[PDB]
Amino acid sequence: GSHMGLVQRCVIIQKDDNGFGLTVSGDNPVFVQSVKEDGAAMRAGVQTGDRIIKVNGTLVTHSNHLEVVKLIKSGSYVALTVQGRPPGS
């Protein structure tokens, strides 16, 4: 659509036999490292190298490391507000 460069998007990840299967590092403007191509991570629409800003509404700019984990783990599926860039624009 309109407005290109930097846009935010929410990804809904569900819990499976293998779990979420995704790697993420960093605080506040959290950044996703990699995701399981054959798992909830990829199935939910997550790509390698994303900028996760929020998780299930609860922003990642207050909750501690174990805190964010407990929040995400506290539930089968969860939505994550992340940001990326248009590849080849």
């Binding site: 779990g19 979420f20 299967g21 995704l22 790697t23 993420v24 590092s25 960093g26 605080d27 490391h65 964010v68 984990v69 995400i72 783990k73």
Partner: peptide, 8 residues
Amino acid sequence: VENKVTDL
């Protein structure tokens, strides 16, 4: 180096 990484 980095004390804020989480893998799930």
